Coordinates of C-alpha atoms and ligand atoms in Angstrom, one line a residue:
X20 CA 2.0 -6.2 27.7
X21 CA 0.1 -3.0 27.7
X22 CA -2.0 -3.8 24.7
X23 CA -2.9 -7.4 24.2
X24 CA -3.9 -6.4 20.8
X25 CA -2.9 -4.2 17.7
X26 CA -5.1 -3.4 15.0
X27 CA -3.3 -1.2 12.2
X28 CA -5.3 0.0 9.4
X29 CA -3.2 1.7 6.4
X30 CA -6.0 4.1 4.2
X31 CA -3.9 3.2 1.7
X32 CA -3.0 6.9 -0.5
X33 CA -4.9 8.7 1.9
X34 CA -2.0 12.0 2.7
X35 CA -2.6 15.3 4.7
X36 CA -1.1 17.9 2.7
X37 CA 2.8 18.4 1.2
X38 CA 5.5 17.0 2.8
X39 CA 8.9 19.7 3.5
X40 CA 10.6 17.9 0.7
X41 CA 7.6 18.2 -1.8
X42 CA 9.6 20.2 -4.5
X43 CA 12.0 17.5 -5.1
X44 CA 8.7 14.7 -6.2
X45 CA 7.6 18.1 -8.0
X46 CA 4.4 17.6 -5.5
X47 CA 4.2 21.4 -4.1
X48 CA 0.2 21.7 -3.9
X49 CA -0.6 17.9 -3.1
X50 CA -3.3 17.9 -0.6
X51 CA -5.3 14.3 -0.8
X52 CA -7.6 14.5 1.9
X53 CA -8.0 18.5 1.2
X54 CA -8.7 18.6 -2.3
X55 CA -11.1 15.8 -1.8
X56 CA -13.0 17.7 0.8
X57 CA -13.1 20.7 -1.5
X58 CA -14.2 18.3 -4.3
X59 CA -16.9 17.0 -2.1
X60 CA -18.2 20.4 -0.9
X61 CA -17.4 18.8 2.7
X62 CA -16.6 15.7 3.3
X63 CA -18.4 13.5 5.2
X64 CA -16.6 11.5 7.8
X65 CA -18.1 12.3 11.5
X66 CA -16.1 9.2 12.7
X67 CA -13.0 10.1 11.8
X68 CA -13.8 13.9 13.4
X69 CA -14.6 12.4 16.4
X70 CA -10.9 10.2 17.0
X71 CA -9.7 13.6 15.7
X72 CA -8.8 14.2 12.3
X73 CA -9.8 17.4 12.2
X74 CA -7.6 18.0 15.7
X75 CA -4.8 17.3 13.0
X76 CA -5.4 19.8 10.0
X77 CA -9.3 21.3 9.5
X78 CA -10.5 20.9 6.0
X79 CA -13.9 21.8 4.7
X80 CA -16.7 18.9 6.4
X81 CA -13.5 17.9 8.8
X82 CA -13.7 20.4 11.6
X83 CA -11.9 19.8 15.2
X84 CA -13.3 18.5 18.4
X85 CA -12.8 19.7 21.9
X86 CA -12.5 15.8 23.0
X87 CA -11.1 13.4 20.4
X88 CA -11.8 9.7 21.1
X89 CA -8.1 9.1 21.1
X90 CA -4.7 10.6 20.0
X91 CA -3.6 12.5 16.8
X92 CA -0.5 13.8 14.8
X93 CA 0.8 13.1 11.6
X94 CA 4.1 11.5 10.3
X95 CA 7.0 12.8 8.0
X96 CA 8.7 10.1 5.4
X97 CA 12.4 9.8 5.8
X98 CA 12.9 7.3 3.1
X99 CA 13.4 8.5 -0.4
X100 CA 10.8 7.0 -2.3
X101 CA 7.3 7.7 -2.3
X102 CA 6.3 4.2 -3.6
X103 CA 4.2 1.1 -1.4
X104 CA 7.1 -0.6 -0.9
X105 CA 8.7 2.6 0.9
X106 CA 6.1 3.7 3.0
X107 CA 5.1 0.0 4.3
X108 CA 9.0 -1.0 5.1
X109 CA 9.4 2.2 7.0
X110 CA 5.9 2.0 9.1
X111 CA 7.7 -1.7 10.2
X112 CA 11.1 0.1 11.1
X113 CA 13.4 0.3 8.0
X114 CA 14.8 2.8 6.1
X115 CA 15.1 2.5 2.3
X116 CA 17.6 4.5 0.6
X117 CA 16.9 3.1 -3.1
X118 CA 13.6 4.0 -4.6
X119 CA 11.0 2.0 -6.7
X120 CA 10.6 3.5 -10.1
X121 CA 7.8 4.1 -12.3
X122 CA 7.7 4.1 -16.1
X123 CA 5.0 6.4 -17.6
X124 CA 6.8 6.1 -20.8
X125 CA 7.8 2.7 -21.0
X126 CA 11.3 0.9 -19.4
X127 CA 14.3 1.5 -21.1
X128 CA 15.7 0.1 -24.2
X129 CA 18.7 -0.6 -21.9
X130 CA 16.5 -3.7 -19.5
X131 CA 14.7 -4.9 -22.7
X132 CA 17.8 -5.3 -24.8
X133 CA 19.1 -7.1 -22.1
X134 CA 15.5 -9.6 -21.4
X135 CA 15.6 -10.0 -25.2
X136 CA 19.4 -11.5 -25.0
X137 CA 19.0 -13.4 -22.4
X138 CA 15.1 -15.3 -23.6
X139 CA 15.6 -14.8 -27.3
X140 CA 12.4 -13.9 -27.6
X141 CA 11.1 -10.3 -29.0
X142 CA 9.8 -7.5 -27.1
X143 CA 6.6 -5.7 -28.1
X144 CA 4.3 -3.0 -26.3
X145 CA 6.6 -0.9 -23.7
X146 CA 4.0 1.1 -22.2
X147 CA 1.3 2.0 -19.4
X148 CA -1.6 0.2 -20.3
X149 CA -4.8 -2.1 -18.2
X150 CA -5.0 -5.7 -19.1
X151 CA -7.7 -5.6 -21.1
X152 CA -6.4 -2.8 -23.3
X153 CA -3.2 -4.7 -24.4
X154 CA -4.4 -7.5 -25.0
X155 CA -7.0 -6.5 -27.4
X156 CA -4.1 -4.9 -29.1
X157 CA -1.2 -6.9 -29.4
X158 CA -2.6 -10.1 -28.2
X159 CA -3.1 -11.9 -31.9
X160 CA 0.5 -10.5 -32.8
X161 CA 1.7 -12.3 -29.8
X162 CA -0.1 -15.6 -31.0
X163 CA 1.4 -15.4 -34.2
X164 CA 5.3 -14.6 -33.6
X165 CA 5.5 -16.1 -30.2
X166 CA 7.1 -12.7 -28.5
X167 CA 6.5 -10.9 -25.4
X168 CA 3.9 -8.4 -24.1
X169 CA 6.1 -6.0 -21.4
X170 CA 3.7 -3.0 -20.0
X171 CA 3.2 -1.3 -16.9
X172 CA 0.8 0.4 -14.9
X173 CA 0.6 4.0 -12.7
X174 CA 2.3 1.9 -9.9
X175 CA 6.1 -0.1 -9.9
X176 CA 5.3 -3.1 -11.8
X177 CA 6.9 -4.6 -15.0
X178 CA 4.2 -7.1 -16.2
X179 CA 4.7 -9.9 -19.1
X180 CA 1.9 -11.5 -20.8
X181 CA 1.8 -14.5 -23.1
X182 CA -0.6 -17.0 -24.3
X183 CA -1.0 -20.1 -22.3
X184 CA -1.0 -22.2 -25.8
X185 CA 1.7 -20.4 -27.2
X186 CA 4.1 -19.8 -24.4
X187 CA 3.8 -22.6 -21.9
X188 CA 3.6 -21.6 -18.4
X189 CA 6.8 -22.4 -17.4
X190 CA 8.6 -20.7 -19.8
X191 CA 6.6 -17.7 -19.2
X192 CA 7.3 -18.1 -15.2
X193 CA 11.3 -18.8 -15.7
X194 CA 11.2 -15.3 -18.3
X195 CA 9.5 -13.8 -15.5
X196 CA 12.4 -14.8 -13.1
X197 CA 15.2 -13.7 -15.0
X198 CA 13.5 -10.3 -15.2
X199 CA 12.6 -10.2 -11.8
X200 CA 16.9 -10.9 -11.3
X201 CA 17.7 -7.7 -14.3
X202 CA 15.1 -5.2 -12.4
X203 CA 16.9 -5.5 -8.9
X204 CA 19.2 -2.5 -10.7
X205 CA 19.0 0.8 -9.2
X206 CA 18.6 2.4 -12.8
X207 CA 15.3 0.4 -13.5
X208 CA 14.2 -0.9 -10.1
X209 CA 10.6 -2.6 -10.1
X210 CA 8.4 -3.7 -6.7
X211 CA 7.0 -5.9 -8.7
X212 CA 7.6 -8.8 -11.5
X213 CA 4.3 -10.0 -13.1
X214 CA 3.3 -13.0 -15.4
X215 CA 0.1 -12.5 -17.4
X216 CA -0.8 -15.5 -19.2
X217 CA -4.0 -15.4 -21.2
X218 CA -6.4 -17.4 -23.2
X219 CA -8.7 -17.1 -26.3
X220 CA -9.3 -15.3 -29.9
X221 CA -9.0 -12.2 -31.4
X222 CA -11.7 -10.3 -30.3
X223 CA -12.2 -12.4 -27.1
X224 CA -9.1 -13.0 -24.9
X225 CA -9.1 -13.4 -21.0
X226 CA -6.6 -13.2 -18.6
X227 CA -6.0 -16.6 -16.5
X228 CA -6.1 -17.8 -12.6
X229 CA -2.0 -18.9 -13.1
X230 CA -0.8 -15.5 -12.4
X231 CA 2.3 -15.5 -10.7
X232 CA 3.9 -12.5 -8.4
X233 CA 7.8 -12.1 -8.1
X234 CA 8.4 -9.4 -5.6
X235 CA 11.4 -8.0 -3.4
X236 CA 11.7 -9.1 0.4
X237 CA 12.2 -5.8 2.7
X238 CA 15.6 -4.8 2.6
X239 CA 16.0 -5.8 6.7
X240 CA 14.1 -7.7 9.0
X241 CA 10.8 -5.9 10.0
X242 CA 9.1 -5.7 13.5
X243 CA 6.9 -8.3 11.9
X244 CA 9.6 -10.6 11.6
X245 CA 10.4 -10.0 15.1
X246 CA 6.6 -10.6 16.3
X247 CA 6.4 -14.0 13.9
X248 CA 10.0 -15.0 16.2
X249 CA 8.7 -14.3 19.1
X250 CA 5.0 -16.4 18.5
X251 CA 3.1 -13.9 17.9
X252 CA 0.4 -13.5 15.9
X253 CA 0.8 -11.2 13.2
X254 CA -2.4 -11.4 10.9
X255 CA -2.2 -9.8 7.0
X256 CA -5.6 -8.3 5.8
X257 CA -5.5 -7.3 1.3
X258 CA -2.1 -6.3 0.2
X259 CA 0.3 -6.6 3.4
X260 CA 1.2 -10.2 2.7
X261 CA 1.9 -9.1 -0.8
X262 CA 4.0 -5.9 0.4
X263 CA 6.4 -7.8 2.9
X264 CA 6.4 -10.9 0.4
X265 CA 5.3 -12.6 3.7
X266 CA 7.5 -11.6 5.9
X267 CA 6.8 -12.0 9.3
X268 CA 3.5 -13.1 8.0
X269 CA 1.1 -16.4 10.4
X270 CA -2.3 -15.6 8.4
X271 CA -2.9 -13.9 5.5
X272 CA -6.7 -12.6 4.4
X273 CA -7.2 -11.8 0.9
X274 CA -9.5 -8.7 0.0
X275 CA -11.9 -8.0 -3.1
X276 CA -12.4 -4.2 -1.9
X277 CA -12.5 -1.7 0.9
X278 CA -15.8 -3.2 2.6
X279 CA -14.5 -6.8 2.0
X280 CA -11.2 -5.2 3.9
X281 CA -13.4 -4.1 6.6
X282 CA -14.9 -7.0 7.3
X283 CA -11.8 -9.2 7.1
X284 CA -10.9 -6.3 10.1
X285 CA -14.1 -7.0 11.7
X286 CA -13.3 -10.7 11.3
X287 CA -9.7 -10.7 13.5
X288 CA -11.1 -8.6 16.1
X289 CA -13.4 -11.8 16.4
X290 CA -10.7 -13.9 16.9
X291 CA -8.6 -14.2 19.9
X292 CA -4.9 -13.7 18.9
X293 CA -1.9 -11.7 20.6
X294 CA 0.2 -9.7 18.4
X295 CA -0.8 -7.5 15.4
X296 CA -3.5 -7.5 12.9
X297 CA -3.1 -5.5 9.9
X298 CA -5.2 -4.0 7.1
X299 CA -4.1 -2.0 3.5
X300 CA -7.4 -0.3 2.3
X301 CA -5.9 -0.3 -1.4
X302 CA -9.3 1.1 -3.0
X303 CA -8.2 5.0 -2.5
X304 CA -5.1 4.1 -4.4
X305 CA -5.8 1.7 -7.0
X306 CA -9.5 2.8 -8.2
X307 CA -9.4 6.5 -7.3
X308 CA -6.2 8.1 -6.4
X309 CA -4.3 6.8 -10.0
X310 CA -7.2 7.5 -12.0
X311 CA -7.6 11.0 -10.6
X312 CA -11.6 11.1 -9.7
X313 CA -11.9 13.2 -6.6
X314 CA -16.0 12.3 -6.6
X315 CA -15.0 8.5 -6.4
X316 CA -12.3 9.0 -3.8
X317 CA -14.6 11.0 -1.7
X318 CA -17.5 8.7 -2.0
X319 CA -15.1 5.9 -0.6
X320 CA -13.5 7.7 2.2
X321 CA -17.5 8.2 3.3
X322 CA -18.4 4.6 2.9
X323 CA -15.2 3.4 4.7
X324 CA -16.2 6.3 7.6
X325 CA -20.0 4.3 8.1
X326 CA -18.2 1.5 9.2
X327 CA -15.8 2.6 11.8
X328 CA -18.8 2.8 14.5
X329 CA -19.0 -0.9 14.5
X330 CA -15.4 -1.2 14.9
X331 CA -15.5 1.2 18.0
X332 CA -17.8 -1.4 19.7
X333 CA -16.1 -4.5 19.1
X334 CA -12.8 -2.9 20.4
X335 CA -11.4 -4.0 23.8
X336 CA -9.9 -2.4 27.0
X337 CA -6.2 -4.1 25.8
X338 CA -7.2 -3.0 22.2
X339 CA -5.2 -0.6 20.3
X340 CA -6.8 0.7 16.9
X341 CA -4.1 2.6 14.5
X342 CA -5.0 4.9 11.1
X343 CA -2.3 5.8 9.0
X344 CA -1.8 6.2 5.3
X345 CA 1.5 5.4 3.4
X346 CA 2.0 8.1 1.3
X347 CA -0.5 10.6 -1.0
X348 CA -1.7 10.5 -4.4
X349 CA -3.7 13.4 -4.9
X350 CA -6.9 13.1 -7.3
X351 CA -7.1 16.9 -8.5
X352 CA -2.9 16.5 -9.5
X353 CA -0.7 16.7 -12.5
X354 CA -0.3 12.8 -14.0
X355 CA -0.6 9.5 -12.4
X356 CA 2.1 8.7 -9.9
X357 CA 1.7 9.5 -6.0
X358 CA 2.7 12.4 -4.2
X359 CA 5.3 13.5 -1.2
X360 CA 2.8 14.1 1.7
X361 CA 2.0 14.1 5.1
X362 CA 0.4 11.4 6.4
X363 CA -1.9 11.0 9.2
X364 CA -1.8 9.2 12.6
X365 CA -4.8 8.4 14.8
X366 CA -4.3 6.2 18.3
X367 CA -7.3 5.0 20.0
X368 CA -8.0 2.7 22.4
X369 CA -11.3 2.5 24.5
X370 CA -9.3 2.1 27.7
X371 CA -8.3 5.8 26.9
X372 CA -11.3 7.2 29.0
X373 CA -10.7 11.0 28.8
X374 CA -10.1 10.8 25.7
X375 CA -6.5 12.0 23.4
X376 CA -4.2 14.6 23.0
X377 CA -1.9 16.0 20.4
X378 CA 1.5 13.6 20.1
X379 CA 4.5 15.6 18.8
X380 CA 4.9 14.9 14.9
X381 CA 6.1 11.7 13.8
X382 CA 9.6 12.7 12.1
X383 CA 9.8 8.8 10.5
X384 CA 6.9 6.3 9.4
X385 CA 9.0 4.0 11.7
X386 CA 7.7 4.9 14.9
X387 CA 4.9 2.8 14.2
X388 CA 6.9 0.1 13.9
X389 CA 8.8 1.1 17.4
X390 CA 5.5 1.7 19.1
X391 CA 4.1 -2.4 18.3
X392 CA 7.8 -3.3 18.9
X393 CA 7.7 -1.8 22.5
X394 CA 4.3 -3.3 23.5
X395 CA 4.5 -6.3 22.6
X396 CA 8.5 -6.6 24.2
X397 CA 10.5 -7.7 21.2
X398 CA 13.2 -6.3 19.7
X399 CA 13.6 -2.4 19.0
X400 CA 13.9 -1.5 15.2
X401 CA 17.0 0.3 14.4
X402 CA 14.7 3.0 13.1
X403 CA 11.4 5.0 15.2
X404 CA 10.6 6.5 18.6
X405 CA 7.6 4.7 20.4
X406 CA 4.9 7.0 21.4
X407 CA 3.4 4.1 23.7
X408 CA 4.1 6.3 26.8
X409 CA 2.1 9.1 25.2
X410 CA -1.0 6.7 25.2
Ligands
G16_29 O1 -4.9 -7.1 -9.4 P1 -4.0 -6.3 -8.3 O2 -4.9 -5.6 -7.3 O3 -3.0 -7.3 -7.6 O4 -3.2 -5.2 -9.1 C1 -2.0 -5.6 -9.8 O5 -2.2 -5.3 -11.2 C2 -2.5 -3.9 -11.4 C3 -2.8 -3.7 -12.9 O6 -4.2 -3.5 -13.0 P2 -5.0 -4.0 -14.4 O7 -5.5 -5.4 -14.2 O8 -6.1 -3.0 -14.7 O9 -3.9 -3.9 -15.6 C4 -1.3 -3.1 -10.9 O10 -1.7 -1.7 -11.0 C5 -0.9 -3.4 -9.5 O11 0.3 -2.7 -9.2 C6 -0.8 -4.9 -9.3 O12 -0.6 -5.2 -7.9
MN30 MN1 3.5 15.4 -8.6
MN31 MN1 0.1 2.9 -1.3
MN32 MN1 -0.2 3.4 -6.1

C-alpha cells in the first residue's frame, strides 16, 4: 500500500461557490465559503491557505500560495440530491438517483392519512419546529388525547414524539417503524425516522435518553464495506456511523461538537490502525449553516483552522489527510435548506516534500471513494476516477 493510512475529514456544509446545475435547486448566488469571508471582512484560516485553499478559488482573507503543502481542486455532485445522505454515499462510490426531501411546510396529508390508518392514533403539529418549541406547545394536548407529535427540522427527518407515560416506548418505537416503512416512497422520502419520547408537566417537559434512529442503508455497497471485508480498519468519527447506518463501520466515535470532532481525529491518528479514519464536522451545518449566521459560521471555520497545525505534526510519511465538504448551505441565502455547490478537495501528505499541484476537477464526489479504494487494493467502486497517481 501506498498510504498505510487515510484520514478523511468532511467540513460538513462547507461549499465553494454554485455548482453548473445551480438553477435547477434555485441556488444561482450560493457561495458558502465566499459569503462568509465577505461576512467576516476576511476570513481567517492561514492553515487552510497554506495546503491551498486559496490555490482553489481566492476569496477575501483566503489568498493563494506559490507552494501549497499538498494538492487542490474541487469536486462536482453527479447525484441528484443535495441532501447528507447524497453527498456521503457518492464520496464512498455510489450514485443516487432518488433524492431526500425536505418539508418546510409540513409532510403531506397523503403520508399522515396513511400513519393515522395504520396506528389509529391522531396526528397533531405537521411542521418545522426544535424540540423544545413543540413540546411546550402541544406537549399537554398530547398527554391528554394520547395522539402524535409529527414535526421536522431544516434537514430530512420526520420526527414523532410522545410521552413515555402516556405512549409506552414500544408502541412509540413500532409507530416509528411503520413510518420509517411509508417514507421509503419517492413522493415523501425521509433520511431519517425519529422517536422523541419525553417526560414531565406543562410548563416543564424534557426530552429523554430512549431516543431511537431508523435510517436507510446506502443504496449499494460502499468502499467502506469493501475495507470492513477486507480487515480493515475503517474508524467513524460524529455523524458517519449515523450516515452509512454502519455500514462498513469497526469503530464508531461519538462527537458533542467540532473541537470534540477534532480531538476524536487527533485520537485515531494515536492509534495504530490500517484502513480509513473518518470525521463529519456537523457544527457548520447544524448550528450555523441552517440557521443562516454568517458571524457564527465564520467564527467556527477559524476555530477549526487553529487546530489543523497540530494535526500537520502528528501526520506520518504513509499518512494521507483529505478535506472535503458534502455539499453547501450558504448562511447569507434565501430559507433553510442547503444549496447546489462546489465543494472543495485538499490532498496532503507530509511525504509530499515539494509540495502539491492543481488535480484536474473532480467531475463525481466518488473519486474519493476510488482513490481509498485504489490504495488500500480492494475492490473499485462502479463509480470515481482515483487521483492516487496524481499524489
Ligand atoms: O441531535 P442530532 O445532532 O442527532 O440532530 C438530530 O435532530 C435534529 C433536530 O434538532 P432539535 O433537537 O433542535 O429539534 C435534526 O435537525 C437532525 O437532522 C437530527 O440528526
Ligand atoms: Mn436556494
Ligand atoms: Mn451535510
Ligand atoms: Mn443539513
Amino acid at each position: 500500500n501506498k498510504y498505510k493510512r487515510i484520514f478523511l475529514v468532511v467540513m460538513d456544509s462547507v461549499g465553494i461557490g454554485e455548482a453548473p446545475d445551480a438553477e435547477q435547486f434555485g441556488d444561482l448566488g450560493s457561495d458558502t465559503i465566499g459569503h462568509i469571508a465577505e461576512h467576516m471582512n476576511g476570513l481567517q484560516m492561514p492553515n487552510m491557505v497554506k495546503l491551498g485553499l486559496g490555490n482553489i478559488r481566492e476569496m477575501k482573507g483566503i489568498s493563494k500560495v506559490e507552494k501549497p503543502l499538498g494538492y487542490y481542486t474541487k469536486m462536482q455532485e453527479k447525484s441528484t440530491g443535495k441532501d447528507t445522505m447524497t453527498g456521503h454515499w457518492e464520496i464512498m462510490g455510489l450514485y443516487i438517483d432518488t433524492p431526500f426531501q425536505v418539508f418546510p411546510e409540513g409532510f403531506p396529508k397523503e403520508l399522515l392519512d396513511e400513519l393515522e390508518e395504520k396506528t389509529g392514533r391522531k396526528i397533531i403539529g405537521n411542521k418545522p419546529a426544535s424540540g423544545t418549541e413543540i413540546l411546550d406547545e402541544l406537549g399537554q394536548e398530547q398527554m391528554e388525547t394520547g395522539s402524535l407529535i409529527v414535526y421536522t427540522s431544516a434537514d430530512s427527518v420526520l420526527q414523532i414524539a410522545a410521552h413515555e407515560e402516556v405512549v409506552p416506548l414500544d408502541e412509540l418505537y413500532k409507530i416509528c417503524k411503520i413510518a420509517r416503512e411509508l417514507t421509503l416512497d419517492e413522493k415523501y422520502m425521509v433520511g431519517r425516522v425519529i422517536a422523541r419520547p419525553f417526560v414531565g408537566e406543562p410548563g416543564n417537559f424534557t426530552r429523554t435518553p430512549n431516543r431511537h434512529d431508523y435510517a436507510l442503508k446506502p443504496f449499494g455497497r460502499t468502499v467502506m464495506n469493501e475495507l470492513k471485508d477486507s480487515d480493515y480498519d475503517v474508524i467513524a468519527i460524529g455523524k458517519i456511523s449515523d450516515i452509512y447506518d454502519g455500514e462498513g463501520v469497526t469503530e464508531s466515535l461519538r462527537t458533542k461538537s467540532n473541537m470534540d470532532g477534532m480531538d476524536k481525529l487527533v485520537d485515531t491518528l494515536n492509534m495504530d490502525f490500517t484502513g480509513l479514519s473518518f470525521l463529519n464536522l456537523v457544527d457548520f451545518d447544524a448550528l450555523f449553516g441552517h440557521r443562516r449566521d454568517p458571524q457564527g459560521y465564520g467564527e467556527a471555520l477559524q476555530e477549526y483552522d487553529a487546530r489543523l497545525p497540530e494535526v500537520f505534526a502528528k501526520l506520518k510519511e504513509d499518512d494521507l489527510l483529505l478535506i472535503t465538504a458534502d455539499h453547501g448551505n450558504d448562511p447569507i441565502h434565501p430559507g433553510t435548506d442547503h444549496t447546489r455547490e462546489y465543494v472543495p478537495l485538499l490532498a496532503y501528505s507530509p511525504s509530499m516534500k515539494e509540495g502539491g499541484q492543481e488535480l484536474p476537477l473532480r467531475q463525481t464526489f466518488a473519486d474519493i471513494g476510488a482513490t481509498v479504494a485504489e490504495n488500500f487494493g480492494v475492490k473499485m467502486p462502479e463509480y470515481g476516477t482515483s487521483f492516487l497517481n496524481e499524489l
